[PDB]
């Protein structure tokens, strides 16, 4: 502390809800299966960074 | 005599009038500048009644004087706009 | 003591330089982050907030901090597994700071 | 009285019929309505007096002034005027 | 001066001390009144209506209920209900208060002036018919309300009695602006003349 | 035939040094202060008028 | 092209063209639009104010009569400059430098 | 816990972060035993769809709706209210919306949240629709405006006033001659504003000098 | 036939729709795989939209203002269909106009800016002074050679 009182540790464990948010940002750049259920992929991913 | 002349575009340029986009920009900058240097001058007269002139010059920034700086700024702009109004009016009456 | 200009052939002090001069170049690219924004993020929405709070927020609002009474935000250490952009985290924020 | 009403109403009307100009400035007789017109230099056209013509007549006199160049002041004179005060 | 009254009294909502102090009930009302005057529509929204503290206090004092009504109806552009609200605000809030007894008359004038301003800006022309009906008064009444504020030069508007319209002629052009500017320089030219001369003698 | 093609005096940089040395006159036209350009503006009207 | 050239005014009414060319007022507009299209003249076409206000005269054959016009118009211009010059000498006679 | 963070965000006018919470909340209540938690699940389903209406997405409405269970195990009046309002919005049609909430009023009355965000949605579409009409015209009749939007005249006029004070096209309305003129021109010049600061300062300064120069007196 | 068609559309013209339609009805409309098919009857209908957009572009440039009453006549459209066509072509950002609903005018102009006008004026004065400066040299040249 005082050098560095703020310390942010970044996980990769994440949350289900966290993965939905990464997808959206991507989707703005290039839509991934916009006529099919995206949400399967979210469930299936479970370690992914 | 040869050196002094630099064509006929020496004198033609006195009539020549720039973009008025530029004039407005120069005059804008100068307006703000005088406010910002007026504040600098306000600090100069914050009190400025303590002894010895030399110690005041260093303390209230009388070296690199804000009063002199205001004066120059005003005069360049005042005189420039004087010539611009004059050359414009010259142009109106002369051509048509 | 700071950098200053000297004439080439008169070898004297004729002119002054900012001290900023004659010091490290500041971002060797262009300063800001490429088209990558909070939209592109995709993280880490919360922790990115914590980075905004730390870096941009005091700099934009000084007065706000003065109200709490605290000294302004201390250094940040970004550690974790990679592929977290942690480097991109700083660039994104800094973009928006001005 | 009939005079003062006549100088004022140049700025107040553009025309009156012969009945209405009588009533307003108080003329007593029909002939008096037209006689006072010639003297204040309003024409009668179609039984109507026009104050607008007096307006114009006043305007031509201003232009026959030789006083008016320096008084109104050319744009070119004004800029010169400001310039030279400093140069003193 | 209500400008300094609104800056202190709206801030003091958010962290308010009643240790050897007065009630929050008087201060939330007194704060709303002075905010209504000074703040413009945009900041009215921020600091009065969307104030979380004022929200939470809800309607529990008749005073509070009276001034709350009045700001909302000014904001949402309603005119029918503004005219009876104004009357109630005066009766139940301004008068009982000792300190706003003194500013009671000013509140009524300005409040009408403020609701007119919004309407006059937004329209080039009105009818005397439509304006009157909208506030919820008549043609005979509206003509008197307007004869107070227009000769003082607040609203910058005329009423065509002959046509039946309320015409708008608020200058926003350079001419309006030049007039403001020369009033600042003319107070300068006089003040130089007195300070300059005075030193010249002694 | 001999057609007119635009010309102007502009000076080299190495030339310049001497041009500065030999000009020690006040310069009636040099584009200076308020004074210098009020003299110019008049000069300019008679220039054009003769052309 | 000829009438706006010889006149000093550089905006021409529709009624002027209608009498000269012996055509309806309808037919006149048409003529103007076609002149803009060719590059015979260029400028703005105002139907409401019934103008054509030109910005370009495409260069024409120059006969002795047109030189006479061009020469005349520049005598007035030379006189205009000269009169302004006499005024410019009167104000500021006392100080120049 | 998740749902309540959802409601709060939805209201802060962020609809991505909101959406993920209501998604979780839908899944929680489907996976618990349904005795009272279908009810709570149906309510949440309205809120997931509601997030996306505000973002103006009907693709991701297609993805979330399904005939497997979100229209056959949660087939309800709120579903029919949502895909009417969703469809209306994209068309850019206020008319359609207006008619959709007449027969689905009970959805605004029962749901606080649905109502806050449909109030906003109304205002948003009317504002949008207007800009398009008044761009290529000036001196357009107020009556004309009413034809296209599909509202009473008197309504149109009160609505448009607000949006002059809102200050996104700021013109003036003619009640008596029934025109709208659009003004979009600058309302000050830069040199005049910078002048105001300048003469203001000099006013102060001269007083300050005299304070120092009154030693003569 | 093709040659007159291409030429018409390239160069800037004012033309009226039932007279152009009458020219190319026994010519182009009976040529199959263009206009003579069935769903190319609605590519013929489309030819009209392209003609009335051509007239709108031309008239936009050359006419600074024109009454709406007039503009209707020249385009061969009804009042209602004129306004909607102006509007669509202003969304697509090519042209700019202000159309009155009382139907007094259409002002095909985007209202010109203060700075640009002044800029435009200052340049013209420099062209007059340059023009005279060059002329004087060529007077000297001609007199002496004579
Ligand atoms: N939140 C995000 N949304 C979008 N793209 C992202 C995001 N996070 C990371 N990425 C992508 O992954 C890349 C790798 O991230 P970054 O370069 O910041 O790594 P790091 O964690 O700092 O590693 P090291 O340990 O090497 O410093 C980014 O350049 C970006 O393309
Ligand atoms: Mg890194």
PDB file of N, CA and C in Angstrom, chain H residues 110-188:
ATOM      1  N   UNK H 110     -50.348  -2.716 -14.215  1.00  0.00           N
ATOM      2  CA  UNK H 110     -49.793  -3.711 -13.322  1.00  0.00           C
ATOM      3  C   UNK H 110     -48.338  -3.617 -13.122  1.00  0.00           C
ATOM      4  N   UNK H 111     -47.557  -3.156 -14.142  1.00  0.00           N
ATOM      5  CA  UNK H 111     -46.080  -3.152 -14.103  1.00  0.00           C
ATOM      6  C   UNK H 111     -45.665  -1.774 -14.095  1.00  0.00           C
ATOM      7  N   UNK H 112     -45.029  -1.338 -13.054  1.00  0.00           N
ATOM      8  CA  UNK H 112     -44.423  -0.020 -12.788  1.00  0.00           C
ATOM      9  C   UNK H 112     -43.338   0.254 -13.758  1.00  0.00           C
ATOM     10  N   UNK H 113     -42.501  -0.782 -13.991  1.00  0.00           N
ATOM     11  CA  UNK H 113     -41.259  -0.714 -14.729  1.00  0.00           C
ATOM     12  C   UNK H 113     -41.470  -0.639 -16.217  1.00  0.00           C
ATOM     13  N   UNK H 114     -42.476  -1.424 -16.693  1.00  0.00           N
ATOM     14  CA  UNK H 114     -42.905  -1.566 -18.064  1.00  0.00           C
ATOM     15  C   UNK H 114     -43.449  -0.200 -18.504  1.00  0.00           C
ATOM     16  N   UNK H 115     -44.283   0.397 -17.573  1.00  0.00           N
ATOM     17  CA  UNK H 115     -44.842   1.730 -17.767  1.00  0.00           C
ATOM     18  C   UNK H 115     -43.823   2.884 -17.847  1.00  0.00           C
ATOM     19  N   UNK H 116     -42.748   2.908 -16.957  1.00  0.00           N
ATOM     20  CA  UNK H 116     -41.694   3.956 -16.934  1.00  0.00           C
ATOM     21  C   UNK H 116     -40.962   4.037 -18.216  1.00  0.00           C
ATOM     22  N   UNK H 117     -40.672   2.817 -18.770  1.00  0.00           N
ATOM     23  CA  UNK H 117     -39.950   2.595 -19.987  1.00  0.00           C
ATOM     24  C   UNK H 117     -40.823   2.592 -21.241  1.00  0.00           C
ATOM     25  N   UNK H 118     -42.154   2.566 -21.159  1.00  0.00           N
ATOM     26  CA  UNK H 118     -42.970   2.785 -22.297  1.00  0.00           C
ATOM     27  C   UNK H 118     -43.312   4.284 -22.443  1.00  0.00           C
ATOM     28  N   UNK H 119     -43.251   5.023 -21.265  1.00  0.00           N
ATOM     29  CA  UNK H 119     -43.399   6.429 -21.251  1.00  0.00           C
ATOM     30  C   UNK H 119     -42.207   6.976 -21.993  1.00  0.00           C
ATOM     31  N   UNK H 120     -41.037   6.510 -21.728  1.00  0.00           N
ATOM     32  CA  UNK H 120     -39.845   6.942 -22.393  1.00  0.00           C
ATOM     33  C   UNK H 120     -39.874   6.531 -23.835  1.00  0.00           C
ATOM     34  N   UNK H 121     -40.357   5.341 -24.181  1.00  0.00           N
ATOM     35  CA  UNK H 121     -40.319   4.865 -25.492  1.00  0.00           C
ATOM     36  C   UNK H 121     -41.199   5.738 -26.375  1.00  0.00           C
ATOM     37  N   UNK H 122     -42.416   6.160 -25.876  1.00  0.00           N
ATOM     38  CA  UNK H 122     -43.431   7.056 -26.562  1.00  0.00           C
ATOM     39  C   UNK H 122     -42.740   8.328 -27.059  1.00  0.00           C
ATOM     40  N   UNK H 123     -42.063   8.940 -26.057  1.00  0.00           N
ATOM     41  CA  UNK H 123     -41.420  10.218 -26.259  1.00  0.00           C
ATOM     42  C   UNK H 123     -40.354  10.176 -27.167  1.00  0.00           C
ATOM     43  N   UNK H 124     -39.574   9.061 -27.147  1.00  0.00           N
ATOM     44  CA  UNK H 124     -38.484   8.820 -28.018  1.00  0.00           C
ATOM     45  C   UNK H 124     -38.969   8.722 -29.479  1.00  0.00           C
ATOM     46  N   UNK H 125     -40.111   7.928 -29.767  1.00  0.00           N
ATOM     47  CA  UNK H 125     -40.493   7.672 -31.166  1.00  0.00           C
ATOM     48  C   UNK H 125     -41.099   8.839 -31.813  1.00  0.00           C
ATOM     49  N   UNK H 126     -41.842   9.614 -31.031  1.00  0.00           N
ATOM     50  CA  UNK H 126     -42.462  10.846 -31.475  1.00  0.00           C
ATOM     51  C   UNK H 126     -41.404  11.850 -31.810  1.00  0.00           C
ATOM     52  N   UNK H 127     -40.300  11.956 -31.012  1.00  0.00           N
ATOM     53  CA  UNK H 127     -39.257  12.881 -31.213  1.00  0.00           C
ATOM     54  C   UNK H 127     -38.588  12.530 -32.502  1.00  0.00           C
ATOM     55  N   UNK H 128     -38.341  11.217 -32.769  1.00  0.00           N
ATOM     56  CA  UNK H 128     -37.647  10.706 -33.938  1.00  0.00           C
ATOM     57  C   UNK H 128     -38.320  10.926 -35.209  1.00  0.00           C
ATOM     58  N   UNK H 129     -39.625  10.702 -35.188  1.00  0.00           N
ATOM     59  CA  UNK H 129     -40.511  10.663 -36.314  1.00  0.00           C
ATOM     60  C   UNK H 129     -40.624  12.063 -36.872  1.00  0.00           C
ATOM     61  N   UNK H 130     -40.559  13.084 -35.920  1.00  0.00           N
ATOM     62  CA  UNK H 130     -40.750  14.514 -36.151  1.00  0.00           C
ATOM     63  C   UNK H 130     -39.599  15.125 -36.909  1.00  0.00           C
ATOM     64  N   UNK H 131     -38.401  14.755 -36.559  1.00  0.00           N
ATOM     65  CA  UNK H 131     -37.176  15.268 -37.107  1.00  0.00           C
ATOM     66  C   UNK H 131     -37.134  15.012 -38.632  1.00  0.00           C
ATOM     67  N   UNK H 132     -37.466  13.768 -39.024  1.00  0.00           N
ATOM     68  CA  UNK H 132     -37.621  13.375 -40.407  1.00  0.00           C
ATOM     69  C   UNK H 132     -38.615  14.198 -41.243  1.00  0.00           C
ATOM     70  N   UNK H 133     -39.727  14.608 -40.619  1.00  0.00           N
ATOM     71  CA  UNK H 133     -40.805  15.314 -41.330  1.00  0.00           C
ATOM     72  C   UNK H 133     -40.362  16.721 -41.589  1.00  0.00           C
ATOM     73  N   UNK H 134     -39.672  17.381 -40.606  1.00  0.00           N
ATOM     74  CA  UNK H 134     -39.422  18.763 -40.585  1.00  0.00           C
ATOM     75  C   UNK H 134     -38.108  19.141 -41.137  1.00  0.00           C
ATOM     76  N   UNK H 135     -37.189  18.118 -41.412  1.00  0.00           N
ATOM     77  CA  UNK H 135     -35.920  18.352 -42.179  1.00  0.00           C
ATOM     78  C   UNK H 135     -36.074  18.904 -43.585  1.00  0.00           C
ATOM     79  N   UNK H 136     -36.966  18.418 -44.497  1.00  0.00           N
ATOM     80  CA  UNK H 136     -36.939  18.795 -45.884  1.00  0.00           C
ATOM     81  C   UNK H 136     -37.888  19.946 -46.076  1.00  0.00           C
ATOM     82  N   UNK H 137     -38.723  20.378 -45.035  1.00  0.00           N
ATOM     83  CA  UNK H 137     -39.753  21.414 -45.127  1.00  0.00           C
ATOM     84  C   UNK H 137     -39.245  22.570 -44.291  1.00  0.00           C
ATOM     85  N   UNK H 138     -39.847  23.804 -44.483  1.00  0.00           N
ATOM     86  CA  UNK H 138     -39.969  24.833 -43.505  1.00  0.00           C
ATOM     87  C   UNK H 138     -41.220  25.537 -43.935  1.00  0.00           C
ATOM     88  N   UNK H 139     -42.037  26.008 -42.929  1.00  0.00           N
ATOM     89  CA  UNK H 139     -43.321  26.559 -43.153  1.00  0.00           C
ATOM     90  C   UNK H 139     -44.360  25.475 -43.372  1.00  0.00           C
ATOM     91  N   UNK H 140     -44.095  24.239 -42.834  1.00  0.00           N
ATOM     92  CA  UNK H 140     -44.979  23.081 -42.716  1.00  0.00           C
ATOM     93  C   UNK H 140     -46.130  23.302 -41.771  1.00  0.00           C
ATOM     94  N   UNK H 141     -47.435  22.933 -42.138  1.00  0.00           N
ATOM     95  CA  UNK H 141     -48.569  23.125 -41.319  1.00  0.00           C
ATOM     96  C   UNK H 141     -48.577  22.120 -40.209  1.00  0.00           C
ATOM     97  N   UNK H 142     -49.020  22.614 -38.993  1.00  0.00           N
ATOM     98  CA  UNK H 142     -49.025  21.886 -37.735  1.00  0.00           C
ATOM     99  C   UNK H 142     -50.064  20.758 -37.888  1.00  0.00           C
ATOM    100  N   UNK H 143     -51.227  21.018 -38.486  1.00  0.00           N
ATOM    101  CA  UNK H 143     -52.271  20.194 -39.005  1.00  0.00           C
ATOM    102  C   UNK H 143     -51.698  19.076 -39.873  1.00  0.00           C
ATOM    103  N   UNK H 144     -50.740  19.417 -40.760  1.00  0.00           N
ATOM    104  CA  UNK H 144     -50.033  18.382 -41.584  1.00  0.00           C
ATOM    105  C   UNK H 144     -49.284  17.427 -40.788  1.00  0.00           C
ATOM    106  N   UNK H 145     -48.698  17.938 -39.664  1.00  0.00           N
ATOM    107  CA  UNK H 145     -47.892  17.109 -38.849  1.00  0.00           C
ATOM    108  C   UNK H 145     -48.741  15.996 -38.270  1.00  0.00           C
ATOM    109  N   UNK H 146     -50.004  16.327 -37.912  1.00  0.00           N
ATOM    110  CA  UNK H 146     -50.972  15.513 -37.210  1.00  0.00           C
ATOM    111  C   UNK H 146     -51.340  14.364 -38.067  1.00  0.00           C
ATOM    112  N   UNK H 147     -51.429  14.561 -39.460  1.00  0.00           N
ATOM    113  CA  UNK H 147     -51.808  13.533 -40.476  1.00  0.00           C
ATOM    114  C   UNK H 147     -50.866  12.369 -40.363  1.00  0.00           C
ATOM    115  N   UNK H 148     -49.542  12.616 -40.374  1.00  0.00           N
ATOM    116  CA  UNK H 148     -48.436  11.656 -40.422  1.00  0.00           C
ATOM    117  C   UNK H 148     -48.240  10.923 -39.142  1.00  0.00           C
ATOM    118  N   UNK H 149     -48.140  11.593 -38.015  1.00  0.00           N
ATOM    119  CA  UNK H 149     -47.968  10.992 -36.645  1.00  0.00           C
ATOM    120  C   UNK H 149     -49.244  10.207 -36.254  1.00  0.00           C
ATOM    121  N   UNK H 150     -50.510  10.697 -36.505  1.00  0.00           N
ATOM    122  CA  UNK H 150     -51.760  10.058 -36.202  1.00  0.00           C
ATOM    123  C   UNK H 150     -52.272  10.474 -34.831  1.00  0.00           C
ATOM    124  N   UNK H 151     -52.157  11.809 -34.470  1.00  0.00           N
ATOM    125  CA  UNK H 151     -52.623  12.297 -33.157  1.00  0.00           C
ATOM    126  C   UNK H 151     -53.560  13.397 -33.382  1.00  0.00           C
ATOM    127  N   UNK H 152     -54.353  13.817 -32.332  1.00  0.00           N
ATOM    128  CA  UNK H 152     -55.176  15.000 -32.381  1.00  0.00           C
ATOM    129  C   UNK H 152     -54.197  16.252 -32.528  1.00  0.00           C
ATOM    130  N   UNK H 153     -54.767  17.346 -33.131  1.00  0.00           N
ATOM    131  CA  UNK H 153     -54.006  18.562 -33.378  1.00  0.00           C
ATOM    132  C   UNK H 153     -53.508  19.251 -32.128  1.00  0.00           C
ATOM    133  N   UNK H 154     -54.409  19.367 -31.143  1.00  0.00           N
ATOM    134  CA  UNK H 154     -54.253  20.115 -29.922  1.00  0.00           C
ATOM    135  C   UNK H 154     -53.146  19.430 -29.140  1.00  0.00           C
ATOM    136  N   UNK H 155     -53.080  18.067 -29.132  1.00  0.00           N
ATOM    137  CA  UNK H 155     -52.064  17.251 -28.471  1.00  0.00           C
ATOM    138  C   UNK H 155     -50.661  17.624 -29.018  1.00  0.00           C
ATOM    139  N   UNK H 156     -50.576  17.694 -30.373  1.00  0.00           N
ATOM    140  CA  UNK H 156     -49.348  17.832 -31.196  1.00  0.00           C
ATOM    141  C   UNK H 156     -48.655  19.106 -30.823  1.00  0.00           C
ATOM    142  N   UNK H 157     -49.414  20.160 -30.734  1.00  0.00           N
ATOM    143  CA  UNK H 157     -48.995  21.439 -30.339  1.00  0.00           C
ATOM    144  C   UNK H 157     -48.392  21.497 -28.936  1.00  0.00           C
ATOM    145  N   UNK H 158     -48.927  20.823 -27.921  1.00  0.00           N
ATOM    146  CA  UNK H 158     -48.422  20.840 -26.574  1.00  0.00           C
ATOM    147  C   UNK H 158     -47.138  20.043 -26.435  1.00  0.00           C
ATOM    148  N   UNK H 159     -47.123  18.897 -27.127  1.00  0.00           N
ATOM    149  CA  UNK H 159     -45.928  18.091 -27.297  1.00  0.00           C
ATOM    150  C   UNK H 159     -44.778  18.760 -27.959  1.00  0.00           C
ATOM    151  N   UNK H 160     -44.953  19.604 -28.949  1.00  0.00           N
ATOM    152  CA  UNK H 160     -43.929  20.171 -29.704  1.00  0.00           C
ATOM    153  C   UNK H 160     -43.253  21.308 -28.954  1.00  0.00           C
ATOM    154  N   UNK H 161     -43.967  21.967 -28.021  1.00  0.00           N
ATOM    155  CA  UNK H 161     -43.481  23.041 -27.201  1.00  0.00           C
ATOM    156  C   UNK H 161     -42.380  22.613 -26.317  1.00  0.00           C
ATOM    157  N   UNK H 162     -42.584  21.408 -25.804  1.00  0.00           N
ATOM    158  CA  UNK H 162     -41.656  20.821 -24.831  1.00  0.00           C
ATOM    159  C   UNK H 162     -40.383  20.585 -25.493  1.00  0.00           C
ATOM    160  N   UNK H 163     -40.392  20.102 -26.746  1.00  0.00           N
ATOM    161  CA  UNK H 163     -39.266  19.756 -27.506  1.00  0.00           C
ATOM    162  C   UNK H 163     -38.571  21.044 -28.056  1.00  0.00           C
ATOM    163  N   UNK H 164     -39.204  22.252 -28.046  1.00  0.00           N
ATOM    164  CA  UNK H 164     -38.462  23.489 -28.211  1.00  0.00           C
ATOM    165  C   UNK H 164     -37.665  23.796 -27.020  1.00  0.00           C
ATOM    166  N   UNK H 165     -38.208  23.587 -25.758  1.00  0.00           N
ATOM    167  CA  UNK H 165     -37.464  23.774 -24.524  1.00  0.00           C
ATOM    168  C   UNK H 165     -36.444  22.691 -24.345  1.00  0.00           C
ATOM    169  N   UNK H 166     -36.668  21.491 -24.817  1.00  0.00           N
ATOM    170  CA  UNK H 166     -35.756  20.350 -24.803  1.00  0.00           C
ATOM    171  C   UNK H 166     -34.508  20.690 -25.616  1.00  0.00           C
ATOM    172  N   UNK H 167     -34.752  21.270 -26.810  1.00  0.00           N
ATOM    173  CA  UNK H 167     -33.811  22.110 -27.550  1.00  0.00           C
ATOM    174  C   UNK H 167     -32.992  21.199 -28.493  1.00  0.00           C
ATOM    175  N   UNK H 168     -33.747  20.500 -29.393  1.00  0.00           N
ATOM    176  CA  UNK H 168     -33.165  19.572 -30.341  1.00  0.00           C
ATOM    177  C   UNK H 168     -33.423  19.938 -31.789  1.00  0.00           C
ATOM    178  N   UNK H 169     -34.367  20.904 -32.010  1.00  0.00           N
ATOM    179  CA  UNK H 169     -34.630  21.527 -33.352  1.00  0.00           C
ATOM    180  C   UNK H 169     -35.092  22.952 -33.247  1.00  0.00           C
ATOM    181  N   UNK H 170     -35.570  23.340 -32.049  1.00  0.00           N
ATOM    182  CA  UNK H 170     -35.949  24.691 -31.498  1.00  0.00           C
ATOM    183  C   UNK H 170     -36.338  25.622 -32.621  1.00  0.00           C
ATOM    184  N   UNK H 171     -37.713  25.754 -32.817  1.00  0.00           N
ATOM    185  CA  UNK H 171     -38.289  26.578 -33.745  1.00  0.00           C
ATOM    186  C   UNK H 171     -39.362  27.282 -33.016  1.00  0.00           C
ATOM    187  N   UNK H 172     -40.427  27.823 -33.735  1.00  0.00           N
ATOM    188  CA  UNK H 172     -41.495  28.511 -33.080  1.00  0.00           C
ATOM    189  C   UNK H 172     -42.642  28.098 -33.847  1.00  0.00           C
ATOM    190  N   UNK H 173     -43.765  27.946 -32.988  1.00  0.00           N
ATOM    191  CA  UNK H 173     -45.017  27.425 -33.425  1.00  0.00           C
ATOM    192  C   UNK H 173     -45.959  28.569 -33.550  1.00  0.00           C
ATOM    193  N   UNK H 174     -46.786  28.511 -34.560  1.00  0.00           N
ATOM    194  CA  UNK H 174     -47.720  29.578 -34.936  1.00  0.00           C
ATOM    195  C   UNK H 174     -49.032  28.933 -34.583  1.00  0.00           C
ATOM    196  N   UNK H 175     -49.693  29.425 -33.550  1.00  0.00           N
ATOM    197  CA  UNK H 175     -50.969  28.867 -33.168  1.00  0.00           C
ATOM    198  C   UNK H 175     -52.016  29.478 -34.124  1.00  0.00           C
ATOM    199  N   UNK H 176     -51.881  30.801 -34.446  1.00  0.00           N
ATOM    200  CA  UNK H 176     -52.905  31.523 -35.092  1.00  0.00           C
ATOM    201  C   UNK H 176     -52.778  31.441 -36.592  1.00  0.00           C
ATOM    202  N   UNK H 177     -51.547  31.082 -37.100  1.00  0.00           N
ATOM    203  CA  UNK H 177     -51.482  31.022 -38.583  1.00  0.00           C
ATOM    204  C   UNK H 177     -51.201  29.612 -38.959  1.00  0.00           C
ATOM    205  N   UNK H 178     -50.933  28.729 -37.966  1.00  0.00           N
ATOM    206  CA  UNK H 178     -50.847  27.319 -38.179  1.00  0.00           C
ATOM    207  C   UNK H 178     -49.697  26.939 -39.114  1.00  0.00           C
ATOM    208  N   UNK H 179     -48.475  27.339 -38.660  1.00  0.00           N
ATOM    209  CA  UNK H 179     -47.257  26.955 -39.256  1.00  0.00           C
ATOM    210  C   UNK H 179     -46.210  26.616 -38.192  1.00  0.00           C
ATOM    211  N   UNK H 180     -45.145  26.020 -38.651  1.00  0.00           N
ATOM    212  CA  UNK H 180     -44.073  25.680 -37.785  1.00  0.00           C
ATOM    213  C   UNK H 180     -42.961  26.235 -38.713  1.00  0.00           C
ATOM    214  N   UNK H 181     -42.021  26.980 -38.145  1.00  0.00           N
ATOM    215  CA  UNK H 181     -40.790  27.397 -38.793  1.00  0.00           C
ATOM    216  C   UNK H 181     -39.683  26.819 -37.963  1.00  0.00           C
ATOM    217  N   UNK H 182     -38.615  26.337 -38.627  1.00  0.00           N
ATOM    218  CA  UNK H 182     -37.509  25.629 -38.043  1.00  0.00           C
ATOM    219  C   UNK H 182     -36.413  26.572 -38.195  1.00  0.00           C
ATOM    220  N   UNK H 183     -35.629  26.676 -37.062  1.00  0.00           N
ATOM    221  CA  UNK H 183     -34.584  27.573 -36.918  1.00  0.00           C
ATOM    222  C   UNK H 183     -33.592  26.649 -36.347  1.00  0.00           C
ATOM    223  N   UNK H 184     -32.349  26.813 -36.775  1.00  0.00           N
ATOM    224  CA  UNK H 184     -31.315  25.811 -36.398  1.00  0.00           C
ATOM    225  C   UNK H 184     -30.052  26.602 -36.520  1.00  0.00           C
ATOM    226  N   UNK H 185     -30.112  27.943 -36.533  1.00  0.00           N
ATOM    227  CA  UNK H 185     -29.054  28.866 -36.794  1.00  0.00           C
ATOM    228  C   UNK H 185     -28.437  29.215 -35.445  1.00  0.00           C
ATOM    229  N   UNK H 186     -27.186  29.630 -35.295  1.00  0.00           N
ATOM    230  CA  UNK H 186     -26.561  30.094 -34.060  1.00  0.00           C
ATOM    231  C   UNK H 186     -27.098  31.325 -33.380  1.00  0.00           C
ATOM    232  N   UNK H 187     -27.129  31.299 -32.035  1.00  0.00           N
ATOM    233  CA  UNK H 187     -27.976  32.008 -31.212  1.00  0.00           C
ATOM    234  C   UNK H 187     -27.065  32.928 -30.500  1.00  0.00           C
ATOM    235  N   UNK H 188     -25.735  32.982 -30.842  1.00  0.00           N
ATOM    236  CA  UNK H 188     -24.774  33.933 -30.335  1.00  0.00           C
ATOM    237  C   UNK H 188     -23.620  33.914 -31.371  1.00  0.00           C
TER     238      UNK H 188
END
